[model samples]
Target: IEEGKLVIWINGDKGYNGLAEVGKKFEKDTGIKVTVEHPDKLEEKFPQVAATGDGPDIIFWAHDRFGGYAQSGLLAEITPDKAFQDKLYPFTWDAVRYNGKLIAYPIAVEALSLIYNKDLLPNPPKTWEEIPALDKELKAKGKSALMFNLQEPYFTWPLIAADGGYAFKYENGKYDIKDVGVDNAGAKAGLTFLVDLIKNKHMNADTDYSIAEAAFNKGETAMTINGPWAWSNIDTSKVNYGVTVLPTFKGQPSKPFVGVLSAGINAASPNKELAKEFLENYLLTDEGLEAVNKDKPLGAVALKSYEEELAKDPRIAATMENAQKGEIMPNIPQMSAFWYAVRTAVINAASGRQTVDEALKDAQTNAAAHMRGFIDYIKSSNEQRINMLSEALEEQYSHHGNWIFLRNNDQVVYQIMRSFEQNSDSSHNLPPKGWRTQFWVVDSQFNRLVGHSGPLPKEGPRHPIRYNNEIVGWVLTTPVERLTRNTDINFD
Candidate 1:
């Protein structure tokens, strides 16, 4: 309620290293009391406490849930100045806006795009909705049909995201951050139109990255959504695929949620002046955002000044194009809760566990509880993490020694005959490369009975010798002084 103090609450699990520096910067800049709080069980406890009319002035949640938090009146309405708003990409700025109100200050855009099989149908489909009709023709050709991992939201967002579905409220210029439309008609239309095909064996509810990817490479299915990691796994000979732009919607092209890590003011706070003054004046500026990049180079930011100096990368350009036409995933806090509910909702509806209506409705109630429970379970169980670490360690360490000979013997072994060094076999008249003009005399065995260097060890470890089950002989780098005493012993 006072003018000199402000607190920002963040989840304890997040990285807060230079955050103290950021806080110190704000305090130094504004002459206000600035502090940070990492509250445990904040997700389970915040909304109830927020409505109690007391808490930190600002709450940090990754992915701004604009409409959900605003619709429930948990976040205050912020109208960014047009100049400041001009700094962000249109949909990315739109990502933090709900019902004509700004939800949060955007941090950065981490972008992703789509991949296609270059061989299947000659040209990739232009719009996402066209995949279904295109699927019919691909299947009729007796070839594997077009496919996507229907269960994965991140991979398959082009269907609902670029369209009006967007998993949130949207009409004209307004898009909701909460009271999400993930189960809405547009959501259902796009989701059911493709996802329902799983029942007909057209798509698979059991599909993830592997199933979808293998299907494409094995000639099972022709297309899928993917990140940069997908290309390496593909069998290039069978599937000549390429990475390119995201698909289009009903009539317009679709886009991807480019990236996130933003700032915003809490609605229930009393010291709005203290919080807003610090946030707007000290944090949202190009100067303020630049301070954060002191951590790492996050290419292509919300500001154009930095954008001008950015590296020229076609990948980043494609990502920005996809990001421009799509809602940024990290744009809201409710999405943290929403993906949870929407995940189960999409799964249930697609799998026939319930109707789309019931599943979406149930997902709304169950997402937070499920997320809260799942996160708790995930942290407590180290087995998954341990397994990953173990496999990586085995892979990394397994090749440390002589891996070739350590595993097994070669199928064809050759005893280096004297003819190997001479041209007596008549394979080629060309002598070996790197000859030192040295000479050697040996017994029936290939061991160097006399050779160059100094004296070869007659019996000690200095003698490079070994005995095999089938054969026995060895060589040394030098002739032994004891053996050299016999001048007539074929030293000639």
Candidate 2:
């Protein structure tokens, strides 16, 4: 072995390959020898090596799993100098911050966007409602609209949140576990819209992420929801394509999860200082940022100046726009349950096995139970203040409702109440003629009321009586009553 050597053990073959690339560059710049080891089965190997206190000099992992490693004391606390911190993205640094201490140097940041075929879809759908319409338009031309990965539930978080659902909330710079607002009215409405798309033949459940990307690359499907990983597989020459932000619900913006991969110096490594030096130079350089962004097109967490320089490319610019609305994926230990339960619920709803409301309610219940242990753990660790604030907020913003109606001349003209019912037989149609219109209200209970199609006067008889500060029902002049007034009623 060469003198001044450092051994590094990565979790998998892919990481092994990535480390090799980094090693080649590291050795060329510094006269340090690097021994890279890729374990066949990391799940079995990591703990064994960690327990021995003889692991590699550096460890790399996705930020989502950082909580477990940090909690178990398997990873080292990263103490990058101020200059290093100044060069990195604020959120990227935050992801590795465990209990007010830095834990790692972020190497790659992954944020997803809406990917569409430039040949077919010249413009990406801006909103969720437009997706169905675009699908229909493409279908008429014998092309598929979009595709998603159903097997991977994490991919559905953006869609679920776009429809007005959230698993957890970030308040006061801390992640709070609250089961409230899981099955909000907006979520149900969004789900119904998605279900309708499937039922109406606008999308296919079998077309997963890979298939969709393949189809798009081969000029089959027009669009798909995917990240930068698919960029390498795409045929750039044959496919004229662009990336944009994922569609939102009725123009309400929805945020996606920002996934960061961090490189940390092993706490027990013999070459800890060398590993830190390597990470500092490698992660902060333009060459290193380009290596990460070249294939994925995701924005780098290195520095705003470097990112702006990189964003000069069209592809990177589009990716940056998409990343702006992203939230860092939680690194909290309790987040595991949140992800699992929410994914299950969203997938079940998407697969037609359960209504959105039912699926979300189930997830909420499971999450509450799963979080009990985490709550106690936090309390035992003297973090009860945070938990208490979270609980209070959860109680405050837990439930919601939507009142969709058409207002004509200051009076409600049309209204339809929707629920989590899977049956599509329920219809909301215009009523028969000759009835003077008034206001209508559709309560959270799915109750409906309709009246005159004209405006309500400010000083009118208040034909629609109010109960408990809400409109219970509306009164209207009957057809016969109108006819008896010597006025000719137009039946049309």
Candidate 3:
């Protein structure tokens, strides 16, 4: 076990150079020797190296692919040491955690945002509702409103979620497989919004990330969604550029998925302890944060440190703010299915192969089914009440139900309990005092119950329901006659 010699394998030539710089500094400080192997096909090479029981001392790559390695036992678990675990962000650490074990230490993170040409679009739209107007205004001026990678599956998430839709439900700090947000009304609205943009020629469906950025640089398009990594190639001065957070839907901010590149120790290495010590002192230090921030300005994962150091950089500030709203991408094996379904839904909707509603519905249905099985396995030993509550709530407010059941569901909550404007007059004004109501949970904060006198009229108390509180679930009541009696009717 020579103290100076350490072997590391990284994904590509660019990433390899980035690590080599950091490794040189680390070695200089500790009298250690570092060697980095930059393989063209690192993914393929990883298993071959591991098979010989002689892989690199450390491996660096994107966290998205860690699940497969963890499942195959190719990666080492590093959670037994608590000291190192305490230094990382909750979400960052959680992304590398599988079955309660740490598989990697994330060194950087990246998120998507809207990069707009300020000269053409002085102000980018902040919500989906504003996109149409912006598109029309831009087209009138002979300018395109937006561009993005149409072929990449990852691009659709912002569009889907911006209108209040999700590819999967994330509840209780973990990904819930019950896709309650697909084909949801909000998602449908979002897709329709995108389709309309495409139809109006405000945005194109054929450009990839590189082409989109090139178009924006060449002044062919006014805006695009991209990350900081594209900054180097973009000619900022050619056109006035501004970076900002992605817009929202109904005031609900669109949360992008955070991509992390973390660090891990080799479980089989004789120098495991030394590796941990080196990382603890070197990677998480203020200098290490600066090194990453300098080398890859867009991918720094050190939130607190980077914020303090980069407070003055406008571009970094925009990227940081955008990332703050990000949801850590799921590290689960089921992510494969989630990606395929979500991409298919968005692409089909964008291309007009299916209605936004149809695409979302199919995506949600398939995701829900897949999750039901996966979640059941993960929570088999725990109490099922919370799970049941979570799943039921998800279904009730799913993408399709958001608008469809908005009024029906709203009446169930006491806080929102007021006569519907659509049903304000007539004989069905009030429910009889003793009417029984059925209830359904909406979320940790609300619930919905529904029962009524008959078909909701254009005028009158359309529906009667009550919201219950102080605990587990909410209540709703059905319409009934006003009570008038000395004695009360008691039925159980």
Those runs of model 1 whose alpha carbons end farther than 4 Å from true positions after fitting are: 1-3, 12-15, 63-66, 110-112, 115-148, 152-157, 160-203, 209-243, 249-251, 255-260, 268-271, 293-301, 307-316, 327-492
TM-score of each: 0.50, 0.66, 0.67
Residue-by-residue lDDT tens digits, candidate 1, 159-188:
654555655444433333334555556665
Worst 10 residues of 3 by lDDT: 483-492
Two-way TM-score contest, 1 vs 2, winner = 2
- lDDT (0 to 1) per candidate: 0.54, 0.59, 0.61
TM-score ranking from best candidate downward: 3, 2, 1
RMSD of 2: 23.6
Angstrom error of the Cα, residue 410, model 1: value is 90
Candidate 2 per-residue lDDT over residues 358-463, each given as its tens digit = 8877977887777766555533432222222222222222332122232222222312112211133333222222224333332334244344344544442223
